[PDB]
Amino acid sequence: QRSTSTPNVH
Amino acid sequence: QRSTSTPNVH
Amino acid sequence: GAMGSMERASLIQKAKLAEQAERYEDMAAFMKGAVEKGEELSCEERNLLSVAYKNVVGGQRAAWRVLSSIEQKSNEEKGPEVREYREKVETELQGVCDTVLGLLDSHLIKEAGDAESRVFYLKMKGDYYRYLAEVATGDDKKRIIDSARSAYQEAMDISKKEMPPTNPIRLGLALNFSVFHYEIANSPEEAISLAKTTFDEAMADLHTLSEDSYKDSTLIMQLLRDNLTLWT
Amino acid sequence: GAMGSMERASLIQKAKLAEQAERYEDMAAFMKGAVEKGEELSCEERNLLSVAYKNVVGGQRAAWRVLSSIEQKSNEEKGPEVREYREKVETELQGVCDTVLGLLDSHLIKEAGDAESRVFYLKMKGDYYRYLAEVATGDDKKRIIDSARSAYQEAMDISKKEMPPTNPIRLGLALNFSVFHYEIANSPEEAISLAKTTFDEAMADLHTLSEDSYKDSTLIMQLLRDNLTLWT
Ligand SMILES: *CC(=O)N1CC2(CCCN(S(=O)(=O)c3ccc(Br)c(F)c3)C2)C1
Ligand SMILES: *CC(=O)N1CC2(CCCN(S(=O)(=O)c3ccc(Br)c(F)c3)C2)C1
Ligand SMILES: [Cl-]
Ligand SMILES: [Cl-]
Ligand SMILES: [Mg+2]
Ligand SMILES: [Mg+2]
Ligand SMILES: [Mg+2]
Ligand SMILES: [Mg+2]
Ligand SMILES: [Mg+2]
Ligand SMILES: [Mg+2]
Secondary structure, three states: OOOOOOOOOO | OOOOOOOOOO | OOOOOOOHHHHHHHHHHHHHOOOHHHHHHHHHHHHOOOOOOOHHHHHHHHHHHHHHHHHHHHHHHHHHHHHHHOOOOOOOHHHHHHHHHHHHHHHHHHHHHHHHHHHHOOOOOOHHHHHHHHHHHHHHHHHHHHHOOOHHHHHHHHHHHHHHHHHHHHHHHHOOOOOHHHHHHHHHHHHHHHHHOOOHHHHHHHHHHHHHHHHHOHHHOOOOOHHHHHHHHHHHHHHHHHHO | OOOOOOOHHHHHHHHHHHHHOOOHHHHHHHHHHHHOOOOOOOHHHHHHHHHHHHHHHHHHHHHHHHHHHHHHHOOOOOOOHHHHHHHHHHHHHHHHHHHHHHHHHHHHOOOOOOHHHHHHHHHHHHHHHHHHHHHOOOHHHHHHHHHHHHHHHHHHHHHHHHOOOOOHHHHHHHHHHHHHHHHHOOOHHHHHHHHHHHHHHHHHOHHHOOOOOHHHHHHHHHHHHHHHHHHO
16 A cells, blocks of 8 residues: 555645 | 436356 | 548457557557458447447537536636637537447448337437537527437437347447437437337336347336436 | 636636546646746646646656566566567656656746745655656666655745644645655655654644644645654
């Protein structure tokens, strides 16, 4: 399971 | 709500 | 074409990879290159072709519907941008439908071959004329709707002669024809009687389910039921 | 470019329509055309640019990972097709990263402007170098990783000087830098200490949350927590 980066938010 | 047509299956 | 130099078998392999990668435009391009080799497609290869192009045009149809709904709401009680962008998506969608229909006409729809392939391809012709008809207007539109109906009807006639009533291509074709009647042709009664006749006749001959196929059959039977529940 | 004749405001409008239509390639093209007008982007326009390109490269990254996993498993205990198609997706991904980095360098990264825009664009430069580094090899790869690190570090220095510790750009930048340390630089301790320092300092100054912004801040704080839980 890979690290989580900043997601999309709009 | 629109009618349902044949879906994708694979 | 861009796939001209690749071996047919490599094109099939890559379409399968593209499906696993959810790269459906690539998938469609690989399958178009495979069709253009001029050999028949197997059942499994027809599935690859169908899944790829349905995914592509499905995303275009969904986009077109979003934009059209915005466009209609901006035409009840200012600039050209919504119409322009809807036209841009519409033009791409028609281009994909033209490509599929060209493949069907140039390569896939033949006089011989088994009933499955003949019914499947005629169904596909009806479907992509139907998608063109969803966005069509005027003199272009009347000829599109007739084209869809005639393709569906030829497929129906073959399917009723040559396939069991539970056959998933026959069921899927009837499901899609009924959608055409309801959504495109403005014929709710024709849609309803076809969906009910199809469901009832599949149930009456339920013993004809095929063991490599019955999950698909029963899936379409339920979708006919959902549409009938929606339509009544 | 293809968007050269359209008004900036029309490009912004159409990018917003493309987002509603989930047409993220169109969205990215509209926003590239808007950037090429040579005017600064607002916070809202930066979001459009970011969402569009992240969606495009995100789908490419996901595809690349699927194909790479197939490729590695076919290299443990036959034809070239998997490698070829992985290279095809890889090349497109690098092309999108090159486009974004070119926009950043040609148009967006400036000496002046507010800390938000300066930090955001440097963070974005670090991100797209990081995406290049996920697929890079050899002499190309060392220069990519240094490029990502230097962009992230410059953004970090500005953010710590000029922003509160709950600022969502500062938090998102720190989150992404820590991912770089863990996944790219092979520096788990550096990643962990940065994620923990960032979380703790945001909590220590929780009163600095902004009322137009606090949902984004607390979202990133939780993502730092998830990564720390994963990494420990
Ligand atoms: C064997 C053959 O010619 N086949 C199987 C098919 C794969 C492509 C699409 N279809 S279909 O459009 O007839 C269809 C799709 C989904 C379902 Br659940 C279904 F029952 C039938 C069949 C062509
Ligand atoms: C005002 C400004 O310059 N902004 C707001 C941003 C929109 C684009 C992307 N980000 S971000 O990458 O800093 C980011 C993305 C998601 C979240 Br939940 C977040 F907190 C920060 C910020 C640029
Ligand atoms: Cl447009
Ligand atoms: Cl390839
Ligand atoms: Mg060949
Ligand atoms: Mg008015
Ligand atoms: Mg038109
Ligand atoms: Mg302008
Ligand atoms: Mg061997
Ligand atoms: Mg390479």
